[PDB]
């Protein structure tokens, strides 16, 4: 049910995904820009839920704080996710 994934953010390029909070206050990958960083690395897919970012719980963060945290982060990044299924 829970998966650990990793990706590399070594430039100033955006991740190229959009996030939304749903009714359970869960952080959901809503759209993925084709050709963008996440799309190329295959790290996340639409409907996946992000639980943690580098071991940092998403639950006690606002959407702005998450956006700022992700924009500024660099290097090897680990997500704990709840994957969606086709």
């Amino acid at each position: 049910r829970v998966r650990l994934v990793q990706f590399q953010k070594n430039t100033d390029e955006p991740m190229g995904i959009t996030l939304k909070m749903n009714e359970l206050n869960h952080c959901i990958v809503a759209r993925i820009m084709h050709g963008g960083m996440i799309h190329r690395q295959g790290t996340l897919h639409v409907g996946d839920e992000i639980r943690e970012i580098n071991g940092i719980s998403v639950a006690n963060q606002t959407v702005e704080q998450l956006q700022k945290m992700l924009r500024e982060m660099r290097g090897s990044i680990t997500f704990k996710i709840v994957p969606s299924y086709r």
Partner: peptide, 5 residues
């Protein structure tokens, strides 16, 4: 609302 990262 949606948020870009």
């Amino acid at each position: 609302k949606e948020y870009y990262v």
